[PDB]
Amino acid sequence: VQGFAGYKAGMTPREGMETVPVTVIETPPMRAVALRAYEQRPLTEVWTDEFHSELDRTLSDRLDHALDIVEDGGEHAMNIFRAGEYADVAGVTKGKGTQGPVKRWGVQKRKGKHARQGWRRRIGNLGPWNPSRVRSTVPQQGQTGYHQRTELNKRLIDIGEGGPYTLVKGSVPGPDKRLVPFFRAVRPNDQ
Amino acid sequence: MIQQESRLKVADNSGAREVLVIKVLGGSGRRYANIGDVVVATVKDATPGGVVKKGQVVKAVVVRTKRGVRRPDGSYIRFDENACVIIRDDKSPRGTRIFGPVARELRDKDFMKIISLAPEVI
Amino acid sequence: AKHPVPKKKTSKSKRDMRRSHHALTAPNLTECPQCHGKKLSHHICPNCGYYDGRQVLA
Amino acid sequence: SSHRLALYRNQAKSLLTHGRITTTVPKAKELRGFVDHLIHLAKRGDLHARRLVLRDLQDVKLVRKLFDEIAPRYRDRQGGYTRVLKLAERRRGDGAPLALVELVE
Amino acid sequence: RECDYCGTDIEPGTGTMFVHKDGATTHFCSSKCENNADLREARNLEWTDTAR
RNA sequence: UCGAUGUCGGCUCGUCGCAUCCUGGGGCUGAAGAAGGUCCCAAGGGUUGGGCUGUUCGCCCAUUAAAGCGGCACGCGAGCUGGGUUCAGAACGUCGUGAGACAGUUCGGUCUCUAUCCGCCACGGGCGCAGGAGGCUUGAGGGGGGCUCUUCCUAGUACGAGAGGACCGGAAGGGACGCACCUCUGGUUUCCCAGCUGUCCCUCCAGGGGCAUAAGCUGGGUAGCCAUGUGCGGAAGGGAUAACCGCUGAAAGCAUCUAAGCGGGAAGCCCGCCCCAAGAUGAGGCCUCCCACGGCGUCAAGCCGGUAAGGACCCGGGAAGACCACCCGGUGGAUGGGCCGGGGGUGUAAGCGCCGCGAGGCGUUGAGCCGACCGGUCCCAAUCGUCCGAGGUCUUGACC
RNA sequence: CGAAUGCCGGCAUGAGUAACGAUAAAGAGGGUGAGAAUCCCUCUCGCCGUAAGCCCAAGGGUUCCUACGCAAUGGUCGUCA
C-alpha cells in the first residue's frame, strides 16, 4: 500500500530525561491489498478476497517488504518504525467549518474607536479600481476542518505491543483521537 | 513579555527603583522580555540620584516575571513580580548586590555576577 | 439606501431556471401495519393506532 | 437557559401526571433524558432524592405521587423509563413533526 | 511541604511554584489557596494545613 | 465623464516592477585581514515599536540584516475611517464706506440596511465519461512553502608590526513567520459544583423556588474550542543558467572562453518537499463483483421486471456540518439516550448527633451533587417497509 | 407615432431572498370546530406593579352587550375581533 498507517489514540507526555510530550497511535497490521507495479501493461490493484467479515458490508522497499507480509496472507504489523526515527504523518483536519476572515486567516480587524461600535470581523478590501474586478487571490472565508493535513520530520520515539501501538514525538497528529492518520518517513533532513 | 512601556523594578542597588521597557533586544521582529532576555528601556524613577537618576537611558537583563516560565523540566515557576538588573553592555550588572530571588536562567544565558550575588535562586 | 439593486431586467428564461433547481418530492409513504391504507412511513394514523401497541383513537 | 429549565419543568410535571404527552421531536427527546433521570431518583427513594426531584418539579401531590406511585412499577430496570415515539402529524402554519412520549409501560 | 502551607494541593507528578521579593516564598498548589493567599493574612487563613 | 468618476491622510486586504535596502552570485579597488567603496546579474523571502505632526513627508527615540523606489484613477467610501481641506455657525487677524470677503488660522458641523450579472470563495444539483457495479491510484496540470541573526571548533592558524580578523568546512541557540494541536501552560467553561444579600411562593423551622439580564453576585470549574502555550517547517540533493571564470582552437602561417565543442558558477529557473487534480469532453489504471428479463415492424442504441453487483430513501447517530453533500450505526444491534463503572470537577450535603444563652463548631463525610471525557450492559428508541438500479453501439485487427 | 427620467392603465422584475412593528417567554391537559401554535376552560411558568395601575377629562364618537357569520380588514392561522 506503499507506506505505514493507523489512527489517533491520544496525547500526553511525561518522563524522559527533561520531559517530552507525545501521542499514541493505533495499529496492529490493516491487511494486504495488491502491490504497486506498472508491469507488462498497467498493473495497479487487485482483491482476491481474504478480507474482514464485515467488508462486504461495503463491497522498491516499503511496499516491497509489503510484498513480504502482504503475501504472508494479508496484514503486516506496524513498527518498522523503531527506536526514534522519522515518519511523517497525515491526518484529516478536524471539521472547523465555515468561518471569518479572522481564523480562516490571520487578519487585524476593526481597529479601536470602532473595533467594537457594533462593528467587527469582515476582511477589509478587495481590489484597486483600474486593475479590474477580482483576483483568485485573497482567500475568502475559506472553510477548514476537512482539509487533508500533515507534516514533516516526524520523530517517533517508542512503541510497544499490548496492542500494536506507537508513541511519537510531538502529537500535532492533526485530527482528534479515534481518527485516521498515516505515516511514512520520507525526505528526512534530520535523517 | 514586558515590552513597550511595561514597568518592572530593581533588585540591584544599581540606583533605580523602576524602569519602562522599550525594545525587547535580540534583533527585529521580536516582542518579549522574559527572564534571561535583555531589554532596552529606562528610568521612570530612581532614588535620590544614586548614580543612575530618573529618566535615564538604559539596558538591562530579565530577572523575575509572573508570566510563569516553564522549565525544560515540565515543571513550573512564577513570581509575584516583574524586575531585573541593569548592566554595562558587556552583560554585567551594575547593582553591586542583589535583591529578589532569580532563576537558573541567568547562568544559562550568561549572568554569574548576578547569579552569585542572588539572595536566592530557583 | 439601495446600494445594489439589479441592473438589467432578469431574463424570463434564466429567472425561471434559477427557480429550476427547485424540485417537489411526495413524502416517501409506505402501506400500513394492518390498518391497511397507505401511511406516513413509520406512524400510527386515523386508520391505525397500532404499531405493536394500541395507542391512538378514531 | 431559564427557558430550557422552565420547559423541562412544566413538561416533566404534566408528564408525570399523564405518563405520556405531545411535544415536538426534540421537545420530547430531552424531556426524556431528564424527566427520566428524575424518575431514577424517584427510584433512589428517600429524604434526599425526594428533595431533589421536588427541588425541580415543585409540589407534593405529584412529588410523592411519582415517588411512591410508579417509582415502584419501575424499580428494577436500568433507565429507559421513558419511550419517545415519533408522531404522524405536524402542527399547522408551522409544519413541525410533533411526537408523543411516555413512561414505558 | 504543604502547599507552602496551602493545606491543599494541585497539578501532577509536578505541582508548581509561585514566589515573593526578599528572597522569600509562595510554594504552589490550587486557586482557592491562590487568591486568598496572594491577597492577605497567613494565620487567618483557615481550610488547609494551619486553621487545619 | 456636469441625467454626475466621491478629491487628503489612515484603515484593512494587496499585487505587480526594478533602477535590489537585506539578501546570493559575481568582476574592480588607491583590496592583504577585516570591514568598507565601484558596477554587472539576480527579485527569493524578508524589509520592526514609538515619538510629534488631520497628514504623506519629515525630524528624533531604541532596535535591525533590512529597516528599499514606484506602479495600480497618487489601489481601494456600494469596506470602515472620516482628522482634513472643502455646507450655514462663529471667531479673530485682515480687506472692504460698507456688504462679504482671504490655498491665514481656530471650536463644532446628519458618509445611505436587502449584490442582478460578470467576478471570487465555499458547498451541493445535472450529465457525461456508452455493460451494471464498490473499493484503489496515476498524476499532465495547478496551489502552498522558500528569510534570518547570534553563539562555537576549525583559528585567535592563513595575513600580521600591531589593535585585528577569513575564505573553505562544520556544531547550537533564537527571532519573525506558516502547518497543525492540547499533553504540559494559560482563557474559557450561561447553570457543573460552591459561598450571598433582597424578595414572593413554598406549609412555621429548616430544606428549596423564580426574579434580581437574556445566569442577580461573587469563587472555582473539565470536555470541545483556543494563545500567551506543544510538535513542526522553511533543507539537503539533482538538471538546465544570470553575472562571471576556464580548457580545447579556426578565420588574423604569431593571441583570443570562441560562431561550431566541452566545463566551471547563483537565497534564482525546472525537478525534489507538501496541497489539490482527468468536467486534462484525449473522461485515464487497476481489482472485486453482477450476467444476457420481457413483448411490441428493425440499423426496434424505444418502451417493462429485474440482479441488495449495489445503492438509495426513512430512521439513529457524528469536531461532518448554514442547506446539501461527507462518515459510522440501523434491535443477527451498542448508534443515540439511560443506567453503570471510571476519571474530573466542586469542597464535606440533606439528617441526627454531640460544645456555647445566641451566633455558630465539630461529627457522622474528603460528603454531597455531578454537563460533553473513557469504556460495559440490549432499560428506551434505530420495527416493519419502498425506489431505482446492468446488460453488455458500430468498424477494423491480434490472439484462443 | 420606440420614442418627450410622458400622461392613463394594466404587468413582469429582484424573489418566493427581504420584513412581521420592541429578546416582558412559554408548556401541558381537556372543550368546541369542516379545520384550530394562533378561540374556551384548566393546571405548570414568565413580565409589570409607579406601571404594562384603576380615574377625571381631551379627542373618537356605537366602537358595547347578545345570537348569529368570516368573503376582505386582522402584516400566518383563525370556528377568535
Swiss-Prot record, chain D:
One of its GO terms (biological process) is translation. GO terms for molecular function: structural constituent of ribosome. The keyword ATP-binding does not apply. Keywords: Ribonucleoprotein, Ribosomal protein. The keyword Ribosomal protein applies. Pfam families: Ribosomal_L17. GO terms for cellular component: cytosolic large ribosomal subunit. Belongs to the bacterial ribosomal protein bL17 family. This is Large ribosomal subunit protein bL17. It comes from Thermus thermophilus (strain ATCC 27634 / DSM 579 / HB8).
